[PDB]
Design a protein around this motif. Structure first.
Motif, PDB file in Angstrom:
ATOM      1  N   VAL A  43     -16.736   5.924 -10.961  1.00 10.91           N
ATOM      2  CA  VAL A  43     -15.353   6.190 -10.643  1.00 10.91           C
ATOM      3  C   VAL A  43     -15.240   7.348  -9.625  1.00 10.91           C
ATOM      4  N   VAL A  44     -14.950   6.922  -8.001  1.00  6.66           N
ATOM      5  CA  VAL A  44     -14.686   7.849  -7.402  1.00  6.66           C
ATOM      6  C   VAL A  44     -13.164   8.509  -7.401  1.00  6.66           C
ATOM      7  N   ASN A  45     -12.985   9.584  -8.015  1.00  7.03           N
ATOM      8  CA  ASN A  45     -11.722  10.273  -8.229  1.00  7.03           C
ATOM      9  C   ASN A  45     -11.130  11.208  -7.028  1.00  7.03           C
ATOM     10  N   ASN A  46     -10.706  10.650  -6.158  1.00  9.82           N
ATOM     11  CA  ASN A  46     -10.179  11.498  -4.862  1.00  9.82           C
ATOM     12  C   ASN A  46      -8.523  11.706  -5.186  1.00  9.82           C
ATOM     13  N   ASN A  47      -7.997  11.349  -6.395  1.00 10.45           N
ATOM     14  CA  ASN A  47      -6.730  11.793  -6.615  1.00 10.45           C
ATOM     15  C   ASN A  47      -5.515  10.923  -5.883  1.00 10.45           C
ATOM     16  N   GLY A  48      -5.557   9.645  -6.048  1.00 10.89           N
ATOM     17  CA  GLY A  48      -4.640   8.777  -5.201  1.00 10.89           C
ATOM     18  C   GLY A  48      -5.397   7.650  -4.327  1.00 10.89           C
ATOM     19  N   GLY A  49      -4.758   6.904  -3.691  1.00 10.38           N
ATOM     20  CA  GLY A  49      -5.253   5.897  -2.925  1.00 10.38           C
ATOM     21  C   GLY A  49      -5.581   6.319  -1.523  1.00 10.38           C
ATOM     22  N   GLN A  50      -6.634   6.923  -1.026  1.00  9.94           N
ATOM     23  CA  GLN A  50      -6.898   7.732  -0.043  1.00  9.94           C
ATOM     24  C   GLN A  50      -7.017   6.961   1.314  1.00  9.94           C
ATOM     25  N   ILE A  51      -7.135   5.533   1.004  1.00 12.82           N
ATOM     26  CA  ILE A  51      -7.166   4.685   2.328  1.00 12.82           C
ATOM     27  C   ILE A  51      -5.899   4.919   2.999  1.00 12.82           C
TER      28      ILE A  51
HETATM   29 MN    MN Z   1      -8.530   7.167  -5.071  1.00  8.03          MN
END
Ligand code: MN
Ligand code: TD6
Ligand code: TD6
Ligand code: MN
Lengths: 556, 556
Positions: free
Chosen positions: B466-474
């Motif tokens: 799970v790549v967790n970048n805190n939100g939908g960083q697209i």
């Molecule tokens: Mn994300």
């Protein structure tokens, strides 16, 4: 010139029109194609904005807001399966009357049926389940703003109940700085922009006329059945039936105070069914009756006339009795068909119902789900509301508890899905701002598990009780075949909910006895946060307790 | 006489007919109205049964099973919103071709539109998204068994691809003891019950004809584009293109080995597109192209002819080029249109592609999601498969990595929903029995969070990163407006997944560096279980790395 600019002007008209029809809550999920809708909503100060990442949950959150506030609630999602995920909440709204306005962003027509990403066929997607469907055209200035606002005014103005699906195509580019493109196009609406009314007021009301022969029928031996209705309406139905001298059969959703409690129990007694056979008319107010014995009694009763009063349309009697189907606000209908004081004609049922409550009370001690439902009144938050889940918990409370007159109960008992109960509950809380008790089963909580993210934000204490009997034990109550019951019905998941609560930083309790349950509540109501209270119980005790009480009460 | 027994005989015909069309996996959710179907499925030994409580997840589980096995997969659900939850997987199946047979139990007609619990209007509810829809009539012996099996045989027999909605009304009673009722009704099919073919064989094939001028066109300056196809077809396309001397632009889904890798970067270089302007023909095999630069090149390129070869129907060129749209199995199509050994005509692009990869390699060290994607080829399980999620991760792997030819990659790039990735992956694993690497974002994981229930049962190691970048960083990559970006696009949820893994007893790692990540991998492949690896990374590092690399290669 600028496509992105016109898109947002086009979108701005749609969102500003909605505010003229009482739309205040708007639920938004993230997306790119929805940009024009989302940016217009964000910039408009009339709205209260809610967000969520799960569109199935978003739908139910909105369902909850509309359920309590009785106003239309808007939803914005991006194109694709995001839209499809709104289906459960839309179908429930179609049954119970909530007004959901689904603003679904779409690819423009030139990107449909050509293998473009995140492009699907969206118009007509919800088939016949929306009350009204609008398929908006490709935005263009050659279609005047007055057409767009009118289309929306028509849909919202004539909306008696249920959902409106408004499909909203937008072509790229979606982003870019604001140009003047579309400005003069908007100004063709003049000072409608400063007005508080719709551009087109079309608001016919749908209502049945007074029954002129009511004063004749209220003299007969009648029975009052109360299903789902408002809290104030429940109080009014209790006084009305008491004045008429007709027995009141009150569903847990009626908030009538259930003056003849444990109906699911005493209706199973032959003396009760024998006495109700003298009934010449039944007047049912509200619908979605809960208890099995009541549904069975309704199915078999043969009064001269059967009336159902409710503000939702269509047939509501699953037994198809000869009679009447009356569309009205229940409180209004009662003023039009007033009770006059008359001597009660029931003698045996008041005795039977009291004995029935007595048999339940005698078994109140064991630490099980049947006992929780029976005692739940003792745990209601003061000046709050009850959200009752589906499957066993709503049935046990209907059969075994006596809820106070006028104390607010909410539910999803249209289609009775177990797919949006936590997120629906979050909306029920946010709408009213009241302390909330929500009760659900273990599979129900698993189903909407990610909705615990929404419960991190409540405006008042919300206690979430998860009754964990390891599976859907309603299928221990029904006569399912033993060999396949476990694998193909119960589907025990063998989990607990402590880690679930910790992930979303919610307080958690797993009380082992009544004292510890009482301590957990005392702690939970102190703060405007959600507390998870998990009650671990033996799998089949609730169902068996219910079955034994039925058997016991039928022999009285 | 016995309604419960005939219900089961009627369903028994339905499920037995499906076994004649290669249906082996059946996915079942719990319910009561579904009893005739579910008991019929449970007793039929031909099926492998999977269960789940979430019907949306169930649908995607089936989607994964069908995706890998390329056989039709059956689904059984009870009436109500249970049915609606199947919509997302059905829409996806309609786009990528999976054959899902949805057996949706229904209330009988006399209990529709009259306020009965859990009864909704189900026929036609999925609109135009099933390839075929059957609305079965109310069960009755007055309708011959041969009509019912013929009806199912026509639908599965003519099913080129996509979903079939089979609505199955049943009247109560559903339970009871098995009777003699319906036995002779069934026996009218004679020894069909011991046969292994359909009652009615209707299986016309849909395929494009040989292109008679292929020998003319294969001698021209061509470009080969590979979209999604099977692992074996990918190797064959690579050989085919290499023989022709045509440049191969290979998508992350093609498994061609991507001889001109980082196409998403070098297509951004004006010199590459200048060379591609000499192309007189484009032959694309597969569809659902991933990269923005490839989609932009496709949109603007102007060969004399543009062909798309794929086994699914309809237009697949979102740019609508003059050309051909050829329906065929890609391997079959290559044998019908073989390559001729010819001198490669591209000179600038091989240089650029190499420089592009060099630029990505120069940045491989940082512990970020962009580097993970770049380095993923180094972590593929031996003899395993990759399930790649949606949003950034599928784009970064496409832009920055070179996956080995013929190494199996699976995805949901039909509608690109983030709503069923964990459950699809579970299905992808269960079908092939292979070690599986699955990668998804934090919101995707939250979305299908309860599917961790399914991941407790895999037949071989499954690593879920799970790549967790805190939100939908697209929405950090896209030019979304900063003021509203956080609340209305990114929607950070500020969580971690350690407790979620704990809830479902899955091992969990949160690596801090490459060494700890490789340690996590080494551990995971050792047991037939799911391991959850959460990679916490700086929110916008991935999007910016991609944007910078794009900028750098475009200036080469
Ligand atoms: Mn994300
Ligand atoms: C979305 C969807 N899909 C499937 C179903 C079928 N369904 C039910 C209807 O039969 C209940 C009709 C009703 O309540 O009136 S109850 C039930 C299991 C619930 O288990 P639990 O939460 O652990 O609670 P418990 O049973 O008290 O132990 C299911 C799976 C559904 N309702 N909705
Ligand atoms: C069911 C549904 N609903 C909403 C969306 C819109 N949508 C996307 C499409 O734009 C992605 C088209 C694509 O993949 O090509 S990506 C995205 C956020 C994903 O966040 P993440 O998992 O944490 O990963 P990260 O963004 O890389 O940080 C959303 C919310 C959707 N696709 N499906
Ligand atoms: Mn349960």
């Amino acid at each position: 010139m600028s496509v992105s600019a016109f898109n947002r002007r086009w979108a701005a008209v749609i969102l500003e029109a909605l505010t003229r029809h009482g739309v205040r809550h708007i639920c938004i999920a993230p997306g790119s194609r929805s940009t024009p809708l989302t940016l217009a909503a964000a910039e408009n100060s009339a709205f209260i904005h809610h967000t969520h990442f799960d569109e199935r949950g978003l739908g139910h959150l909105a369902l909850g807001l509309a359920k309590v506030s009785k106003q239309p609630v808007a939803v914005i999602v991006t194109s694709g399966t995001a839209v499809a995920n709104l289906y459960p909440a839309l179908i429930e709204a179609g049954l119970t009357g909530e007004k959901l306005i689904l603003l679904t962003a779409d690819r423009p027509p030139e990107l449909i049926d050509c293998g473009a990403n995140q492009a699907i066929r969206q118009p007509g997607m919800f088939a016949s389940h929306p009350t009204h469907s609008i398929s908006l055209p490709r935005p263009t200035q050659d279609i005047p703003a007055r057409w767009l606002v009118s289309t929306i005014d028509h849909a919202l103005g004539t909306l008696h109940a249920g959902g409106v699906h408004i499909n909203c195509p937008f072509a790229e580019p979606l982003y870019g700085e604001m140009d003047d493109t579309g400005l003069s196009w908007q100004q063709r609406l003049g000072d409608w922009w400063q007005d508080d009314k719709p551009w087109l007021r079309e608001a016919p009301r749908l209502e049945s006329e007074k029954q002129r022969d009511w004063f004749f029928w209220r003299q007969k031996r009648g029975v009052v059945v109360a299903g789902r209705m408002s809290a104030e309406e429940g109080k009014k139905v209790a006084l009305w039936a008491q004045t008429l001298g007709w027995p009141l059969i009150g569903d847990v959703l009626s908030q009538t105070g259930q003056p003849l409690p444990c109906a699911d129990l005493w209706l199973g007694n032959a003396k009760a069914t024998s006495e109700l056979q003298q009934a010449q008319i039944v007047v049912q107010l509200g619908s979605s009756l809960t208890g099995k014995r009541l549904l069975q009694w309704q199915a078999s009763c043969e009064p001269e006339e059967y009336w159902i009063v409710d503000d939702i349309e269509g047939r509501l009697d699953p037994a198809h009795h000869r009679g009447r189907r009356l569309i009205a606000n229940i409180a209004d209908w009662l003023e039009l068909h007033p009770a006059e004081k008359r001597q009660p004609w029931c003698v045996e049922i008041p005795r039977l119902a009291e004995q029935a409550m007595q048999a339940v009370i005698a078994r109140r001690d064991a630490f099980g789900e049947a006992q929780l439902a029976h005692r739940i009144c003792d745990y209601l938050p003061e000046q709050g509301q009850l959200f009752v889940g589906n499957s066993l918990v709503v049935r046990l409370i209907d059969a075994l508890s006596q809820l106070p007159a006028g104390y607010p109960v909410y539910s999803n008992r249209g289609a009775s899905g177990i797919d949006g109960l936590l997120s629906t509950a979050a909306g029920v809380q946010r709408a009213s701002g009241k302390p909330t008790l929500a009760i659900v089963g273990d599979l129900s909580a698993l189903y909407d598990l990610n909705a615990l993210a929404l419960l991190r934000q409540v405006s008042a204490p919300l206690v979430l009780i998860v009754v964990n009997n390891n599976g859907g034990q309603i299928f221990s109550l029904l006569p399912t075949p033993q060999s396949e019951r476990e694998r193909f019905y119960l589907m025990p998941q063998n989990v607990h909910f402590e880690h679930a609560a910790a992930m979303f930083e919610l307080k958690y309790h797993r009380p082992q006895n009544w004292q510890e349950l009482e301590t957990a509540f005392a702690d939970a109501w102190r703060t405007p946060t959600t507390t998870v209270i998990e009650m671990v119980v033996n799998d089949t005790d609730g169902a068996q307790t219910l079955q034994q009480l039925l058997a016991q009460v039928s022999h009285l």
